[PDB]
Amino acid sequence: AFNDLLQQVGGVGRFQQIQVTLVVLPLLLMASHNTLQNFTAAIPTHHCRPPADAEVWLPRDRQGQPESCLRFTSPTEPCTDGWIYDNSTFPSTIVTEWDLVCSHRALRQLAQSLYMVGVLLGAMVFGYLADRLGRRKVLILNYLQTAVSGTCAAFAPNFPIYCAFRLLSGMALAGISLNCMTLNVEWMPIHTRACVGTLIGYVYSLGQFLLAGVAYAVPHWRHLQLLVSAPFFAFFIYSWFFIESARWHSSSGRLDLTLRALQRVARINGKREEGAKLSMEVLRASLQKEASAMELLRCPTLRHLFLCLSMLWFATSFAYYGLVMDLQGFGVSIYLIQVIFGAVDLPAKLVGFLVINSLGRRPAQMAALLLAGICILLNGVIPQDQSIVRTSLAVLGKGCLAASFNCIFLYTGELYPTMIRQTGMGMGSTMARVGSIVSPLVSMTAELYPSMPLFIYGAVPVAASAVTVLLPETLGQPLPDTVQDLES
Ligand SMILES: Nc1ccn(C[C@@H](CO)OCP(=O)(O)O)c(=O)n1
Structure with missing residues (x-):
């Protein structure tokens, strides 16, 4: 009382x-x-440093833009002489300090x-x-x-x-x-x-x-x-x-x-x-x-429910913290892309609080996840020439992922019983940080292909949007008391 x-x-x-x-x-x-490693660790345009023995010293290619790894050995060599970064938009970052470029x-x-x-x-x-x-x-x-x-x-x-x-x-x-x-x-x-x-x-x-x-x-x-x-x-x-x-x-x-x-x-x-x-x-x-954290194991009715929720948490967090970085490459300055990635979160909640109550939790969750996956996967196909139709897909994916967060939070709560609900949401949110740990490690492989990270970020939410066909619907029902009465 x-x-x-x-x-x-x-x-x-x-x-x-x-x-x-x-x-x-x-x-x-x-x-x-x-999200500070967008303004404190940007990458400016750079080229090798010519030896002070004097313009035509760089094996330029791909529409004339100078190379960033070779220097014309004699008037095809690693730089080994420092780089010459530009200072028109990014006067100083981390990569300028310790030379984190091309190697x-x-x-x-x-x-x-x-x-x-x-x-x-x-x-x-x-x-x-x-x-x-x-x-x-x-x-x-x-x-x-x-x-x-x-x-x-x-x-x-x-x-x-x-x-x-x-x-x-x-x-x-x-x-x-x-x-x-x-x-x-x-x-x-x-x-x-x-x-x-x-x-x-x-x-x-x-x-x-x-x-x-x-x-x-x-x-x-x-x-x-x-x-x-x-x-x-x-x-x-x-x-x-x-x-x-x-x-x-x-x-x-x-x-x-x-x-x-x-x-x-x-x-x-x-x-x-x-x-x-x-x-x-x-x-x-x-x-x-x-209330032991191990009772999720050695109990099938709880493990089968824990695996799917962990997968949903992980996929949502992975896609989210894989998309919100790398604001470079949309043709528009980052100071305008940030204020658009942070201003599309109002509709993504006004629609999340209007679709879950009208249809349910499973349809809204699956729709949000699959639509975000498709909008992410579609950017790794359209060439970088387009700049008006290439940021709309990004903002749509971000809104859908925010809606996915706001729906999965309520769904995980309403789904578990009443005694283990306190340590269930904890183990569910913990799996939303392994995603954020493994999200930037995947972006390292962009050296093997200029679009493989964007393809990886697009396939995991789509493969996860097919897991919600194994969970019971819980719209307009009493919260399950114990594991015994949890049947449907
Ligand atoms: N536990 C959570 C929940 C959400 N977000 C992302 C945040 C900014 O996009 O969401 C704001 P909202 O979903 O409208 O509450 C997060 O980073 N961690």
Whole structure:
């Protein structure tokens, strides 16, 4: 009956209207910190450096554009003398610093994959150490780490240092992302748990506008990294005034701390009379009523349901974080493609919340996944000459993939039983990060063919859009209680 207590103290009061916004404000920067290897690691046009023994020194081909690997040995040799990058649009990036061109093309992908290898470990470690130390105690440490290892990478003199510090930044953000929602949904009432679940996805897709603005205001990569990883100091200085969630104190056993927190919340809300009316016996008599991750195995009815959902999660995340990168090659500047990839997410949700309720979950999911797969696969056929009909397919695929996220999140929840639903969505979201790890590794093979990555990104969602023909429909039904009554 804890919700009745929360309603007694005031329900949704000024305390919530302050702490909720102060905790959800630091998610305007996660979009910037995720898709940064588009403005901080761009690749400008480059050609070999002629020896200062003096124009006609480069074996140009393919419509006259100079080669990028040979230098006419005598007036067909590897460069070994540094390159001469252009400085008209990208004055400085990572690839300009450490010469990641024509022999070390895999290093950008290695950095982007090492940033995402340190989001899995983050979501694991800072999720295990959150319900054992405190939500606020972990928020403070993460707000600190994501700025003591995110501005010390903007001053790195080597490549491995940059890689390791980006890994640590990802490790911190992967704990901020969990603890935000976990702490935020515990001080709200029970009837407003879905109005705060669609606010961490409505302010999440506003970081892309901020990125398209900032990265255009500040082109250099060191200044950009520093200016994007600086405000976490301000977000950390005031991170001591947060109030710990009373439900965690209640679960841990210590009830006097819960009573103190509730009295403080009552004083803040302006209900001192009912706050002092609260006592120890009242709480002891009102809250006296108060799942293995391996049980998914050795149980066919659960394993058969887990495999399909894992495949759907993986395919969606893989296609998404394979498409949202490589904004170069559409004939239009990146500062205009970002503000179009981030402004097509409103219709992709207004239609997702209009097709699932009218037909179901299976048809909407399958349609979104297959249409995104086709729109992705069709770009690896049309030649790069077209530039008006080659970005529309990209924006359509991105919208369809966002709709796929928003539908699979609800479907996985409504599908599982009620006791294992907490550790089912966890194992389902974990498989949405192995996808983001293996997504940039595939883009390395673009050396073997100029379109094989685009073909790989197009076939996995299509091969996954045929898995939903094995899952039960769950529109207009009661949520299944146990594994026994889960039949149809
Ligand atoms: N758990 C999730 C869910 C969604 N997105 C992508 C995000 C920006 O496109 O989606 C915004 P929305 O689906 O409208 O909430 C993500 O990166 N991680």
